[PDB]
Write a protein that binds this ligand. Sequence first.
Ligand SMILES: [Cl-]
Ligand SMILES: [Cl-]
Ligand SMILES: [Cl-]
Ligand SMILES: [K+]
Ligand SMILES: [K+]
Ligand SMILES: [K+]
Lengths: 339, 339, 339
Amino acid sequence: AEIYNKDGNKVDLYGKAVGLHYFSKGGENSYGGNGDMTYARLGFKGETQINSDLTGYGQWEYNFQGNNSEGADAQTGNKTRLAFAGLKYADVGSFDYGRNYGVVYDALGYTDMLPEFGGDTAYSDDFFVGRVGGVATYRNSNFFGLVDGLNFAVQYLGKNERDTARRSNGDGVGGSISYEYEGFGIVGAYGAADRTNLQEAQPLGNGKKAEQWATGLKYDANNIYLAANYGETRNATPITNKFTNTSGFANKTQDVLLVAQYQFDFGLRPSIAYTKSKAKDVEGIGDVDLVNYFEVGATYYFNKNMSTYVDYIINQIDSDNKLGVGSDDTVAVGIVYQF
Amino acid sequence: AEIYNKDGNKVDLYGKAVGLHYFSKGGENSYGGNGDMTYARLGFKGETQINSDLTGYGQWEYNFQGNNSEGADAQTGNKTRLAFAGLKYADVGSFDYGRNYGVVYDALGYTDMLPEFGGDTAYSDDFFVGRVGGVATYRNSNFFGLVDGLNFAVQYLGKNERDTARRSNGDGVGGSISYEYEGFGIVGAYGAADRTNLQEAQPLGNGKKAEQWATGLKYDANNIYLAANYGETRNATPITNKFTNTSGFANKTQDVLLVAQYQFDFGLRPSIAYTKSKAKDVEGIGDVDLVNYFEVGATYYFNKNMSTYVDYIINQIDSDNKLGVGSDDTVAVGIVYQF
Amino acid sequence: AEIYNKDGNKVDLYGKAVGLHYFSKGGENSYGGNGDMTYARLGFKGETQINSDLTGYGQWEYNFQGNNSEGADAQTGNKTRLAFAGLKYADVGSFDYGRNYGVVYDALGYTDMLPEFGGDTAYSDDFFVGRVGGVATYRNSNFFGLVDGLNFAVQYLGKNERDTARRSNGDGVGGSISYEYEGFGIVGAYGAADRTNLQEAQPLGNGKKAEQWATGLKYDANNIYLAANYGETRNATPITNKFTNTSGFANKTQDVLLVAQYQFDFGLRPSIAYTKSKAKDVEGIGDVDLVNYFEVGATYYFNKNMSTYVDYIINQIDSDNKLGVGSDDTVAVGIVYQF
Ligand SMILES: [Cl-]
Ligand SMILES: [Cl-]
Ligand SMILES: [Cl-]
Ligand SMILES: [K+]
Ligand SMILES: [K+]
Ligand SMILES: [K+]
């Protein structure tokens, strides 16, 4: 909500409280888990006019987990989601630096619209597919204000040598090109980065370069949302063999995302989706499905602040998965207040 | 403070800064401890009108400890207190889910009014007596809008298998019935829940069911506050034998709470209280007093935002306590700003 | 930004998003490090009028690090900076308690004005030089409203026995006297405190008393800022021998701070500084320079909300430093949004 708006500077303090619970078998062997998954969000989105052409901004976002105790495990899953500050200059472009979404997410944000789950390939702290720290993102709107709908972006991923190879990355350059014409929209994104010494030492994944590319096709008009995403990654997708306890990456992945959603005028929004992600050239196995399911769910909007949703996952992953990926179904029930 | 109120949606961002210090002997052997106990609070309480009869809401609250260093122990005692979202519908009732107070606290909140201490039996993450995660609370006002003063509530505690048996719980159902007539108020609360496998493995506490019940009697009118609480728990109250280093629960407890407070028109609020909590059928000992003291303190209100208080505990616990519970007195001095 | 101002009570919720990156050789051997150093701030500064003469207040501040992953290292560098509540009474003085700046910082805040670095001697959780927990600070303005410019303060440091000797302190009393006359300003601060048993056990540092004193001279008028600080500490400055892996304190230090900054009317603010801190009577070595460099940088202000800065450190520390202190240069580039 906009709490301050004086002398060219506007401040929007936002947040949400989500009463969430998962229903599964037993739910260590399921898709999403079992039990309470209550969480809360908090952050600010500010914007200031320096002049008639130039505008400065800065956004922060935090995730608070409310499914923890007040004891020792009080900080489980508590982290900063977004943290960046930038400048946009008329019909030239916008530049920002800090913790922000990757350029491949510009294509993956097409199918990431499900009530609770979905967007399985949009991994956090994973080069260019999700939220990554130390990225210099340049974004352009309408090709310098000349060609309508034609947007392009470029990103510079800084070297992030961390404790775990799961969250580590080297120096990388990514980009995306998008065109939109009356409801329809097409995106073409690609990113390539170096792999750290800790990532190379892992028994899973082999290569000196990590590549990620994705294409998007959506129709967003007349209360209809039909979306499609196809992507492939090289030494980038984080994998874990549960039988041998081994961490690393998949050498080759092939991802298919399909989402169909409709918005009724009285508030209800049904959702039907399909997700398939197959890992290839995996050392020890070969070919294994990481993510495979059908999605059936609905989100009911009371207004702009209150919403309730159900999300059911028809998991197509079988219990004969060589990695040991969860096979059981997961049902999500959530109640949301947001400001 | 109410920072946003437009189009049926009101947002109240609140918080407090408390400059607190405890005075004790040595204070590992005392009731509350010794040294700096500065803390800060932050959170939001929002509410939105969907229609003339229906209202949606969501509340979040966090505790920040300011008695820590900026080094390694920077996150000691930092956690989320409340995190839930719910809907209230005219004269039908209110339903909410997430992290919220238990139904037994509806009776225990009667004597939990002391300047600093008190409410010893209101343990956090303990089935139904305090703040617990994964609770579906249904609350009714004035019996569907028919009988004045007569309120009743029902709660559904979800299974919370955690790292420690101290913070763990199974599936449980609780309830409370309250009647208020001109100053006077009487509450009757009860809750029963399953005990997890980790709780059963502990050398202290034996049973497959955890039960908690409490009754309340208060007079809150004409600047007078006289309150009384009596309760008993089965395999629920968290205990720790300091001689043998053993964790678990007490098989049977008997709790007595008595509070007498007066509010003067110039700001000062004196407080006199008595608390006794005896644990019975304790394996190895038998009968031991967990909490036993007299309370003498006062809170001075400057206005609605600023307040200072002193809280002195006349600890009646002797140094011959077989569990090894603190015997020394504890003096609290605090300065509070709140918005 | 002031978000609430009704009935004598004003609430200022503030924060900043800083997109920061350090440039260094390799940067474990440098002055400031290498890589992403994005961080975010959040907190409130409230003030309420009780009457025409008396005013109550309370301030809180938190640091969020945005250079971390969403995994295990998500809470690295996240802590509370300020947490206190106090009362100011007309021309008598202001008293506050909690986590607050030390009295020696009143002199050290003179040269702590650099774009990114500087203020090396202002160590956090270090008796009186920086931010410390459990301090009762009394501050006086204009000598009870009689002598203009003449301010004096007194502090009472509470005993803070913590996990590490680095962050530990005993009981202490500090004070500061400041006089300002038309641009010019002179400060004289001193503080003395007890050393805990854990601090005494450390192989570095010897003594039962920790002393800190500093003098300040600045000229702050006509867009000119020329500042100077000279100080000496006894068994107070935290040191670490990187060759032997030893923690403790320096027996004697001598600190010299010099800062020269100018403010241009179009927004740009150049900065030239010099810092020297020499540790004496160090057990095993004798005399070693902790901090020694020249500073060249500039901060450009777009308005009151947006700012960009560059900070270059010409490190004069040689690689023959017997403690093993970083010798390489460090370049800082930052983009800031604040509200
Ligand atoms: Cl997310
Ligand atoms: Cl509490
Ligand atoms: Cl700082
Ligand atoms: K998920
Ligand atoms: K307590
Ligand atoms: K620094």
